Structure formats: structure tokens, C-alpha cells
Amino acid sequence: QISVRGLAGVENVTELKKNFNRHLHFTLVKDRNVATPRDYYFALAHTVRDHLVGRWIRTQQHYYEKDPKRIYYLSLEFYMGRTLQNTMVNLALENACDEATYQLGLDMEELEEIEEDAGLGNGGLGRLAACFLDSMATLGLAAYGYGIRYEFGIFNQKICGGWQMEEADDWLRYGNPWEKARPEFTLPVHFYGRVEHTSQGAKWVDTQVVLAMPYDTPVPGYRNNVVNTMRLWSAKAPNDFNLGYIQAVLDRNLAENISRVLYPNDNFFEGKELRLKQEYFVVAATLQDIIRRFKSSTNFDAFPDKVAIQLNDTHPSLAIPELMRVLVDLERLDWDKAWEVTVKTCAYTNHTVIPEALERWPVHLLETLLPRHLQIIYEINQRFLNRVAAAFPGDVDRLRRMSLVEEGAVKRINMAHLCIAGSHAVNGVARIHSEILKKTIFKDFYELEPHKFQNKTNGITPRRWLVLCNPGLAEIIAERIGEEYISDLDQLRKLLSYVDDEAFIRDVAKVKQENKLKFAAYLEREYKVHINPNSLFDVQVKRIHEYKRQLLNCLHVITLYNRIKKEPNKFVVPRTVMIGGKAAPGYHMAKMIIKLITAIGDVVNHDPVVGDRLRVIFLENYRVSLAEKVIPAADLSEQISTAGTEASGTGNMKFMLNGALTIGTMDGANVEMAEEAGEENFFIFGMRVEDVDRLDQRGYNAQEYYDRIPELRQIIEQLSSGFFSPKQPDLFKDIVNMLMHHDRFKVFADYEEYVKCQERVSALYKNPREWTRMVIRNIATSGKFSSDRTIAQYAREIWGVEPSRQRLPA
Amino acid sequence: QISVRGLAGVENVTELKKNFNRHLHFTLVKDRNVATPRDYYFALAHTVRDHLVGRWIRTQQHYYEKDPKRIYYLSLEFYMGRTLQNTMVNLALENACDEATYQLGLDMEELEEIEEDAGLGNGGLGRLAACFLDSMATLGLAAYGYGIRYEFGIFNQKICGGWQMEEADDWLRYGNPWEKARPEFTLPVHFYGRVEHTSQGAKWVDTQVVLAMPYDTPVPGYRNNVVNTMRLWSAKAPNDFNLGYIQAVLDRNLAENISRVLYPNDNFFEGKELRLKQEYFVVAATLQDIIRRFKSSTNFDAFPDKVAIQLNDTHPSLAIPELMRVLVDLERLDWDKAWEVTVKTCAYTNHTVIPEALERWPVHLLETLLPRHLQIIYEINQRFLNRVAAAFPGDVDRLRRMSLVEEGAVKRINMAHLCIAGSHAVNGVARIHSEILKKTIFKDFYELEPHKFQNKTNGITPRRWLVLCNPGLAEIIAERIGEEYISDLDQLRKLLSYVDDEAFIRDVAKVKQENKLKFAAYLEREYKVHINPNSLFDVQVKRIHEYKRQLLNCLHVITLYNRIKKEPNKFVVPRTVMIGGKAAPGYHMAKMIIKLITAIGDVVNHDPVVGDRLRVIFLENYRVSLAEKVIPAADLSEQISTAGTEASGTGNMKFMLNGALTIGTMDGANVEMAEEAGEENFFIFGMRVEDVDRLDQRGYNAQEYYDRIPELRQIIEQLSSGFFSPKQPDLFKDIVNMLMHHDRFKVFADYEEYVKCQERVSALYKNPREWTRMVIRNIATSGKFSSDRTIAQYAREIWGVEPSRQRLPA
Numbered sequence A, B: 001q002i003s004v005r006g007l008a009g010v011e012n013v014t015e016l017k018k019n020f021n022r023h024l025h026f027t028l029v030k031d032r033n034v035a036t037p038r039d040y041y042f043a044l045a046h047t048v049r050d051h052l053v054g055r056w057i058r059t060q061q062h063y064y065e066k067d068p069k070r071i072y073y074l075s076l077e078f079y080m081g082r083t084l085q086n087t088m089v090n091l092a093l094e095n096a097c098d099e100a101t102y103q104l105g106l107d108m109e110e111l112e113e114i115e116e117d118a119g120l121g122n123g124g125l126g127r128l129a130a131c132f133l134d135s136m137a138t139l140g141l142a143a144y145g146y147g148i149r150y151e152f153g154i155f156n157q158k159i160c161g162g163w164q165m166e167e168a169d170d171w172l173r174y175g176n177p178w179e180k181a182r183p184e185f186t187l188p189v190h191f192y193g194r195v196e197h198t199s200q201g202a203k204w205v206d207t208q209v210v211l212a213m214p215y216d217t218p219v220p221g222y223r224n225n226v227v228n229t230m231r232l233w234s235a236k237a238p239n240d241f242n243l244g245y246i247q248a249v250l251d252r253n254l255a256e257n258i259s260r261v262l263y264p265n266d267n268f269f270e271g272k273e274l275r276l277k278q279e280y281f282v283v284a285a286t287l288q289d290i291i292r293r294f295k296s297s298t299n300f301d302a303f304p305d306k307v308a309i310q311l312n313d314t315h316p317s318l319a320i321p322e323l324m325r326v327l328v329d330l331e332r333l334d335w336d337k338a339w340e341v342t343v344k345t346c347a348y349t350n351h352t353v354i355p356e357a358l359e360r361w362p363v364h365l366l367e368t369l370l371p372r373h374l375q376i377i378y379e380i381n382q383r384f385l386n387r388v389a390a391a392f393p394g395d396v397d398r399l400r401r402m403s404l405v406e407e408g409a410v411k412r413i414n415m416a417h418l419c420i421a422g423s424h425a426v427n428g429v430a431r432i433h434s435e436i437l438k439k440t441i442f443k444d445f446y447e448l449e450p451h452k453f454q455n456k457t458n459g460i461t462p463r464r465w466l467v468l469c470n471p472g473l474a475e476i477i478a479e480r481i482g483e484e485y486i487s488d489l490d491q492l493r494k495l496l497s498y499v500d501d502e503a504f505i506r507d508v509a510k511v512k513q514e515n516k517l518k519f520a521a522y523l524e525r526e527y528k529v530h531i532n533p534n535s536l537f538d539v540q541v542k543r544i545h546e547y548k549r550q551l552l553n554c555l556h557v558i559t560l561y562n563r564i565k566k567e568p569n570k571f572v573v574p575r576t577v578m579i580g581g582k583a584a585p586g587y588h589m590a591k592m593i594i595k596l597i598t599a600i601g602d603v604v605n606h607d608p609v610v611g612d613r614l615r616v617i618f619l620e621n622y623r624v625s626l627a628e629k630v631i632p633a634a635d636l637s638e639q640i641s642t643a644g645t646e647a648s649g650t651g652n653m654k655f656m657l658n659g660a661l662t663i664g665t666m667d668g669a670n671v672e673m674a675e676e677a678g679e680e681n682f683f684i685f686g687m688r689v690e691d692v693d694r695l696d697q698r699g700y701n702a703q704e705y706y707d708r709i710p711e712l713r714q715i716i717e718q719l720s721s722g723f724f725s726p727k728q729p730d731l732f733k734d735i736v737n738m739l740m741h742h743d744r745f746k747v748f749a750d751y752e753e754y755v756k757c758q759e760r761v762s763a764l765y766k767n768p769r770e771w772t773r774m775v776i777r778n779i780a781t782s783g784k785f786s787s788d789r790t791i792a793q794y795a796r797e798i799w800g801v802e803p804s805r806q807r808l809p810a
């Protein structure tokens, strides 16, 4: 047992054991003679869950009595991952449960691997919402996460013949012990219908009703006895729905399809009706719940003082016109009063600037599905543009640029413009991203209302991303500076005075080595793959995207291979290059990149001359639980997006906190990370944002790089001739064609500096002691990237509430 | 507290209370400050459920150790109703729970009303399966009920404007505390595909796979610590199903629709593909489970010694060719050996002779959906007909009459012929029905294999149908003869010596009066209806069918009304005529009969001259839980089906056990009931089966009755002129037209004798003491109709197992 995992008290281990047996018997209805590891996992889950309820009930009763300002975090994604270990950590039950299960003759680690990941997210945005919930509970905020309970989360990725295959993520198959259905709080959500304009007000009539049933999941704070709630809505058809008879009952599934599956698109907008329905569904049900709770705390003037609604991207942007609809149509507030309340209540967070991710809904869709909302949006636009016109007289082009309504082929509603107009605060997720918003994408809006624009650099929770996934590192750190850093990451600074400590250097390096061995093992257990634990672990894990430039990584891998074949008997630092991540099902290029990766592995991993000096592995089904395994085992973190494309990134922070050195561009949060640790302790390379713009003025011509770089030329010719695809020589023609003629991300432009920088990485890896000292400098300055810091800033600068580290009663 | 409800021990009431609070807190995650009656209901349900698990686990472990012959009852319907009270009764926990909830300040009766009925049945057949499960557990048989877990059971009936409106029965909305999902025992079920004939055997290939997930529900025996299992299969799509991406996931619902809803047809065959899929689904999954269990007890010669499969009607008839398919195709047994095993394993129960209920599946359907099964069926037919030909040389018409394959418009498979050929026993459900089977419908089969044909008169469980729904009557009976009768109904005979006991007569009458007051109250509480508790309660509750002749009842009601209007100031015994029951959604005539009933009520209930002398009420949404309320309150039980159409009936038995006198035809079980009680203690009338046949030889002409009976003529003319439908004068033209020209059930032919008999009923009701004495004679001789007797006969004469009343350890 390690200290950070809590006490294994005599009374509590005994108590845990009997409750474990009580659940195995009464809850699972099994005896030890027929129980399987899955049954044991559930008995433990229910036992741990029991320890939450008491705190869950009093935390909620507490907010009712004290009635503080409530924070409502709206998101269509909550990438939670597993819940068992996280709950034990936050409740200081890990050692006790470890001991109790040991005495019962069970391996707790084995049982934890049985829990299904709650993959209700695509990547960064979804995981961010998960970390935020953890931090809000840890900071004692009366916060509620509101989303959709998808029956099927992000698809499970299978690699067949080197190609990605998708398969339904039936995560609820065996049940979810963490959620509590609350059918008694079901709410109606309306769709379609039409608008009637009577004397005293407008009415939305003849609508189709879909019921929203909530499921509450507890969110425990870190050892503070606070347990907040994540409420996920599930779609249910009313019983007089479609109510020949048999068909009517079977068609109920049409309404319930709303919460059936998560759209697997990462940073890509798909204007499908089902998606719009999901967006309104979560917004409509959530706002009724919010108002309900407010009325039970009718002057809505105090609404903004008791309520804060954070829009995680534009996905829940309809909350703005829906709030107006309720206040104006139902509560009968005058427009101006309602608008004042709405603006002071809502705050919007922008997560990316790439055009293809921007939500622009066709007017004909809103027209049919949400007719009243379209009218309200036009009215908002009208009044907003009148403000612009009055502020910039005669600037007609500004008017059309700022309109919420876009003209052209088909009229569309720019949801981002909607969010800015209806929110009192708009923030980017990293300093460079937030500046870009003010200088480019939202320049006009910044000029009209500069006070609205802020920055809130993303963060990650040190509980899941350090204590839970890397207990070995958390321990040696605790041995030196104590445990307070877990909820006050800035304290990692104190580790700076141990940078020359021989014992510490040895331990940091030991923990990393153990993590690598453990992962190298896992690799062979669950995926029959052998790798060399002494090689440098070069990993790039994140969603497959052209802007993330996994292709640039591929070019380097091929460069290393060609250099070896050129001078076989020359020494080179051994490397295990790991690339993982899912591609959206309809993203052809992303799928081709995955195939290219496996194809490279096919050649490189079986070339006798290469030996154990270079291995290319594609990490299958990258998800939260897998991230918890690879990140602690990584030596090199690849964050190589084209400058200006990765708003922030969060994977980068996870790697920094876990002892990996970072090679990357001055993009997103990488800029602040290098700033915190010192550029000398970072492997920075490539074009800066300014260089990218210069190149665009000039005109990006990939041919130029192809002509001046022999090594690069050789790689393109290998791809083109079928060197990596013998049976299908032209298999990668699309990739080559894109790289050569329409590469929006300038892969070639950063190639030279990238491989040069990679050489410096290998040189430092050859000096174990200095590599580790640089690692210590990174870990020691990663404190700023704790989501506790991020949330404390949202709380003070946007929501107007004070965080608190006070422990609620037992 | 009453004695039959068990002891309210000090230690147990205290234990019940803390467990109730434990579940309210830990299971429901609620505090007393926000708990609602529904929450309290669930805390109690979970508390009671806890007492079952221990016994459930040891009963099953017990069967594993002793390895007795297993009884598998296959049914597409299990009309369970509520489970809470039934479980308390069988566990002797009712008084303890009553006391415990009282001390917690709660009314247990109020909480019981919150439980949703498990309406996985249409009527008789489904309820029979429910009573059988209870009796099998009570008789200590290693029995398993196998069916489908429909998401939506029989529809909830609403009456709008006097018309039936159907609405989804979302019985799982708030959850089901009684079931235990067993995803770990999921089994694959195949559909479509084609048949490949290789060297060593035929193969069913290229099939579509649907997963069958089981849900186990405990079935407690009466105070014997035996808890059997009812396993209901749920359809689940495999995860690589349909696996653009979004659509594939959404289409998963196509496979899962198999267990979505119960076909609401009572005694009516609808040849829909979805229905056939349900039938094979339950059969395929069940047989794999059966074999699996057998192999874990490979000579299948002992299979019939360890396994008995009872086919509840022909719905699960595919079990015969499916068993053959597995034994021949998979286990590789020779045809003849496999057939021997199949016949000795299967037994079939026929429930009705009406042609429209007979399952005749089109060959093109089986051809596409189950190609291998069709081949096996042809092979079975071939070999069966060769036996017929050898037994009746030259009788060519017999060959075509007995074929499993019917020629004509479209070829069809007669599933009933299939069941007879592949079963070692075939039984009817009442003596007269079973005789009819041998003399008519299955005469040819009886001639070929007389040994196969048996009778097993239906029964009802005295636990739910006496102790649970009529505790007052069970008590006064127990006060005289003890409690042993509850599991040995024949003991009610002893009540015969109390027929002249003044105290008993007074009590029997008192209990009935209390039941009537309680129901008259319930009527006003949940349906705003006032009735006179002193009137005779004339009730007919069962599914709406033309053969049940609710119309004959209607004619009598109108006769009574016309007679009153004719001589207003003449005295007549007051009556409250209650008719209830659901009509299949597509059964037009049944729906018109419901409207006619309400229409009569509209006129009769508001005629000042009638006063409180006659009331016509239509009991809305008749279901099991409602039956438990009306039956104990009834004075007169209407069992007036045309002789030869009601195979048995079971409602009739429920009324007899509960103190109601019976007016009915010599049909189904009515014949044995009158035989047991004595015809003098029964109100028998109308044509006997022989009279019906004579009339058919002759030719049924309704006009004749219309011409010779003035009162009948007046009624038809009232219906025709719009007397009961002012706004829509021709509203009942279909009814009149049917009665006059195409009445298959000869309503007019029994009219005269029916009203005459009804007059005798009223005369006896005028003499309270003698009416009650006749009631005692009925209750005292109802013992034979206990499903314990029925099951003991199935056990000994069909399954080859001995029932046992031995109590398993605690």
C-alpha cells in the first residue's frame, strides 16, 4: 500500500467486506460458487457507491438550505471514462478497498479493468467537461453538469487489415451502477408545430412531444465530502404517441432515437436534423429544470444572481433563444427585461477556429423544427444589428459580417454569432487562441463589446491524470512535499529544489521505467505485441485529424527508417513510435492516415535490418481508460499541430504532468506550457502563427519543399510507387496528392525543422540523467494546468462565485 | 391483523423497518423529506425482494445437487399482474410488513396500488400460465417458465366518448424490482439465411443474428421456501450489427423490435412476420438454455428423463422442429433417434377449437425466415403420413386431412397438426373441450394414436384468487377449518357442514357486503361513479368476443330496462350490471359491442323513472389487478358463451371461489363446476352442445326468434331506430345486421331461456339467507378447480414427476 491511497483501517476493511458480500448476495443474486470477475466488479462498485449516497444527499440538501448561486454546465459531451477508481480516490477508499478485496482473495486491479468506459464524448471538449465537473466539486461549487444519456457513446475502434472498423459502443449492456434514474422528474420537450399570434402573446402550438427522462450520476469532490450531480437526459415517447396498433408502438422508437447515439465528429459540423434535435432536447429539458429549481428557491431580476449557464461551445446555443421564449412567451416578461436576464445568465466558451467545425444551421431546418425559436433569433439579430449600425454608422459590410443570419446558397444561422450576442462573457481556451478570436474570427464583435472577451486556459484534473493513473509518481512526489498538491497543483513548484537531488532523479526515472514495463506488458497481454521497454516511447494519441498532423509524424518515422537502411550498422537511439486515435466514420482522409500508419508498421516492424531499433505501433481504440495507461508510460509527447489550429489541446498537459518531454509547435496551450517550464526545457520547432500567415500571403507551394529536400522527395516517391503498399501500388495516391496540391496544414513546411528537432530529442535521451532533470523541470511547473485553476478563474471572472476548499460534514 | 396473514414478530418488524430505511436511503437515494408514495413502494418491494434471494439461490443450488427432472413451460404469455402482495403471502410476511409500514407511518394498501401490473398476457391463456407457475413452485417441481420480456404488455384501455382507445402499456417506465437481468447468459438466435447440403450434414448459413438476453423473475411457492424461476428473453442486436454509421446504429432497433410488444389478440390468429419471429425467438433461446443445462447435469437417450417441455398452445410449436434441428444438424443424431427423443420430451396443450384462433403459417413465410425448419417440417409430415397410410390403407382423404401441410390458395403449415405429431401427450383444458377434440377437430389423430389424448381441466391458484384478493373470506373459512386448505383446496368440502350454521351464513354474507362496499367506494374514487351497494352485483368480465356473448347480456339489460319503463311502480330486484374487458384493436365488432354497452349505460343510468333500480357500468381497463377487486365483490357471475365455444374459462372458477353464484351455459368448465356443486346450486340455461349442432343441421334463422318474441323484437327495433344513439341513428346497424343475418353464436337462440333464468336469479336474491346458503355450497365444492390439482395431474400423467409439499430449509 502507498500513502496517497488512504488508510486501510481495521473497522473499515471489515465493513467493506461484509457490504461486498451483502451486494454479491442480495444485489447480484449470486453465490461465490458461480460468481465471475464481472460479478465481483459489480459488488465492489455497489459497495463503493454506498459510501457516496450519504454525501450526495446532504450535499444537495445543503445547497437547498444555503441556496447559493447555481452553475449549470451545458454540454452535449461528457467524456467520463471509468468511475470506480476515481470514486475511491476522491473518497480515500482505495487502500481499504484494495485490502478488503485482497482478503476476499480478489485482485482489485483486475476488477477495475472490467468497468466499461462511459464514452459520451469525442475527445478534448468532452474530456474537458469531465475534468471541469471534478474540479467544480473539489472547489465546492453548486454545479450541475447537464447533457444527454446516449445509449451508444463513441464507437469502439477495431483495426482490420489495417483499416478502422467501427462497432456500436453498447456501454449500458451490463448496466450502470453509478446512475440513478429519476423518472419522477420527467419533462416534456416540444418539436415542430407552428406559431399562433393571439392578442396577448404568441403561442407555439400543434407540437410533437418527446419526454426527457433524467438520470443522475454523482460527481464526488476530492476528499471534501462534496458530491455534485451530472444529470443526463434520455428520450422517451409519450404513451399516447402514435396513439396499426402494433406499428404505432414500434414507431415509438422514432422519438427515442434522439438520445440513441453520440455523433462521432470531432471538430466537424454535420448539419443533420437528428443532431439539431439532440441540441434542442438537452437545452429545453435543462432550462425547465433550471427554472423549476429557481422558483423553489416572481421577479426574474434575481435570476442572474442565482443562475449561471455555461455554454460548452455552440452545441447548446439554443439555450439563448429558448430562455427568451420561456421568459417572453410563458412568463410574460417584456423583451428588453428578458434579454437583460438572458445575457447576464449566459456565458459562452469557444473551442476552435477551424471553419469546418463552425455550426451554421440552415434556416429551413429551424423553420420546420423550431419555428418560434427562428422568430426569436430574427428579432435578436434585428436588435443586435441596430446596435452595430448605431456604433459604426454607414459600415454596411460590418453589418453583414456580424449578422446572425448568413445569406447565400441557403440562408444559415451562425450559432457562434448568436452565442456572442446573448452572452455576457465569451472566452477562448488558451491565451493564443483567445487572442486569435479578438484579432480574427470575432474581431468585429470584440470591437463592439471588448468587455465580453476573456481567456480561460484549459486544464486537466490532477486526480484522474496523476493520482489515479500514476500512483507511483504521485507517491514519490508526496514523499517529498506532502499531499496538499493534489488539490493545489501549484505546489509542484517545490520539486524544483530537488532537480539536483540524486535520490529524486533516480526515483522519477524508476517510476517511468516501471510504467513503461507495465505498459509493454499490457501491450502483449491484450493485443499480442512485443516491444522494447528500453527504447524511447514516442507517442501521439488524440483524434485523427489533418490539422493534428499525424502525417508529419509519419514522415519522420519513414525518415528514421530510410536512414537506418542507408547506414544499418550506425547507432541510433531505439524508439517505439506509438500513434493512436479514432477517425470520424465519414472522414475519408483520416481513415487513410490510419491505414498509412499500420502500413508503415508492416514494413518497419518486419525489416530484419531494423531489429529492435524502431517499432511503429498503432494504439487501437484510444479512449480515456487507454489514455490512463499510455500517458504515464510516455517519454516523448507529440503535439505537432500547425500553429494556429489547435485551440488549446489538453493531452499535452496530461503528458507534462506525467513525466514526458514535449516536442511541439507554438500552438494552443503548448505556448503557455513552454512559458511555464522554460523554452530550454521544451522541444519547440516549426512555424509560428505569423510564419503561417506570411506563407499564406505568399502562397503555399509544397512542390518547393519537395524539390529542395532529397529525403522528403524519397519518402513521397516511396508512397507513390507502392513501397508501403505492394499489392495496391496506388493505395496512397490521395495522401500524396493532398500533400502535394491541397495541404491546408503545410506538413512539408515544418518537415525539416521537425526532424532536426527530433534529433535533439534523441541526443538528450542518450543522457538519462539530464533527460530526467528536464522532466523534473516540466513536472514541477505543470501546476498552472490544473483544471482547479481554470475553474477558479471561471468562477471568479465569469460566474461570480467564490470557490471553497471547506470539507462538508461526514 | 388477521391470522392467515402471518405473525408480526417483534424481531422481524424491527428488521423490516431498518431494511426499508436502508433501501430508501442507499437504493432509492432519497430522504424522508422528499420521498413520495412511489419511493416508499419501491423501498418495500426491495425489502420484500431481499427475503426471496436467499431462498431463490438455495432452491436453484438444490436442483443442481439433486438433479431432478426439469419442467419447461413455454408460453408467449405470462399474465402475472402485481408481485408485491403475492410475494408477502407466499412468504408469510404480510402482517409483519403491514405492521412495519404502519409504524413507519405508512398505509401498505396505498403502496401496493402503486405497483404496475405485469400485463404480459391477453387473458385466459396468459393468466393460466401465471397460476401454473405458482402451483408448480408450491408443489415443489423443478419448473421453469420461459417466455418473452415484452417492453409493452397488453395495452391500457381508455374509454373516450364511449369508445375504446388504446395506449402503450409502458410497465417498465419506473423499473421492475422483481427481475434480475442476466446479460452473462445471452444466447444467439438465427433468422433467414439458407441451407447448404454438404457431405456430412446440412448447414444453416448466412443467417441474421439476434441476441436473446434473459431476465429472471423469482416465483415463490406457498410457504415452502421454494422459489422457482421465470426466465423472459429480451431481444438485443449484436454490436457489429449493420456494422451511414449513424443509421446503422439506429437500425439496431429493427432486431430489438422482436420483444417490443405483445400481440393483443385473444383467440385470434394474425399471420404477421413479427409474430412468427417472436415465436421462434422464444423457442430457439429456450432450447439452447435447456440443452446447456442438460449437458451440465453425450447420450441424449436420457434427455426425456431429465427434460419435459410443455407447449402452451401452438405458439411455441417450433420447439419441435427446432429440437430436431439441433439433435440432427448439430449433435448429429440419426433422424429416428432424434424423433424419439423429441416426442418423449414434448407435450402439447390445446386451448380452443374456434377456427380463427388456429395457427396456419404461410409456407412462403417459413421458407424465407426459417428455411431449415421448413425442410424438417416437410420431412416430419412425410414420415407421419406414411404412418397414416400404413394404418388406414387407401384412405386418401384422411391423408390430406391429417397433413401438416394444407394446400389451396397459399400453402400453409397447420401448427396444431405439427404439435400432435411431435408430442407424446395432447390435452384439452376441460372435460367437454377434450371430448370435443377427440370427436371433432382431432378425430383422425385420436384414431391413429388414442393414447396421446388426455384432459387436464384448468384451475386457478387459491393464493392470489382467495387469500390475496379476499382475505376476509379466507379468514372466516380458516376460523372454522384451519389454514391447510390454502394448499389443499379440497378441504373446503368441510364447509358443507356449516351450511346450516347461522353464524357462518351471517359471516359469509358479511364478507360479501364488505367487499361490495369497498368496491363501490373504489369505483367513486378512481372513476367518479356512484352505485348502490345493496343491489345485486351482476358482472361479466373477460375479453370482449362475440363467442363470449356480451351481447346476450346486453339484450337482457335492455329487457330489464324496457320492463321497468312498462311498469315503473312495480318492484324489481335492484341490480348493478358490470361489464368489462378489452377488445383487440383490430376487432371491429368487439369495439362496437363496447360502445353499445356504454350507450346503454347512457340511457339507463340517466332515466329518472329507473332510479337506483338499474345501473349499467363498463369496467374500464380490465386487468389482473382489477379482477382481484371486482371478483370478490360479485354476486352473479356471467359465463354465457355459446355451448361448445369456451374451451374451459377460468374467470368462472375465480367467481365460484369468491362467493358469487353462476349463471351460465353448459360450456367449458361450467359443466364440471355445476357437477361439483350440484346443478340445483347453479343457474344453468340455454342450448347444450347437441342442441347447437341440431340447429346447425337445420340451419340457424334468427328471423324466427325475432318473429316469435315481442320483447326481442322491441329491442332490435330500438337499436335500429337510434333509441340508444340519437345523434347517430344508424350507429349500431352492423350489430343488428350481424344478429339478424350472420350470427355465428346464436345470441337469439338462448335469449328466452336466459332472461327466464335471470328471473330465477332475482327471486333467490330476494331471500338473503337461501342465496347465501347456495353460495356456501358453491365455495365448499370449488376445491377441484385449484391449479394445484391441475398441476399435480400434469406432473403425474404427462411429465412423470411426483409433486411434493416438503418445505426446503430456511
Ligand SMILES: [N-]=[N+]=N[C@]1(C(N)O)O[C@H](CO)[C@@H](O)[C@H](O)[C@H]1O
Binding pocket: A123, A124, A125, A126, A128, A267, A313, A351, A352, A429, A458, A646, A647, A648, A649, A650, A668
Ligand atoms: N470542440 N472542440 N475543440 C477542441 C477539441 N475538442 O479538440 O476543444 C478542446 C477543449 O477546449 C481544445 O483543447 C482543442 O484544442 C479543440 O480543438
Ligand SMILES: [N-]=[N+]=N[C@]1(C(N)O)O[C@H](CO)[C@@H](O)[C@H](O)[C@H]1O
Binding pocket: B123, B124, B125, B126, B128, B267, B313, B351, B352, B429, B458, B646, B647, B648, B649, B650, B668
Ligand atoms: N388461448 N386460448 N384460449 C383460452 C383463452 N385464452 O381464452 O385458453 C384458456 C386457458 O386454457 C381457456 O380457459 C379459454 O376457454 C380459451 O378460450
Ligand SMILES: *Cc1c(COP(=O)(O)O)cnc(C)c1O
Binding pocket: A122, A123, A124, A127, A541, A542, A543, A622, A623, A624, A627, A648, A649, A650, A651, A652, A654
Ligand atoms: C485528453 C484526451 C483527449 C484530448 O487530447 P488532445 O491531444 O488535446 O487532442 C482526447 N481523447 C482522450 C481519450 C483524452 O483523454
Ligand SMILES: *Cc1c(COP(=O)(O)O)cnc(C)c1O
Binding pocket: B122, B123, B124, B127, B541, B542, B543, B622, B623, B624, B627, B648, B649, B650, B651, B652, B654
Ligand atoms: C382469469 C382472467 C381472465 C380469463 O377469464 P375468462 O372469463 O375465463 O375469459 C381474463 N383476464 C383476466 C385479467 C383474468 O384475471
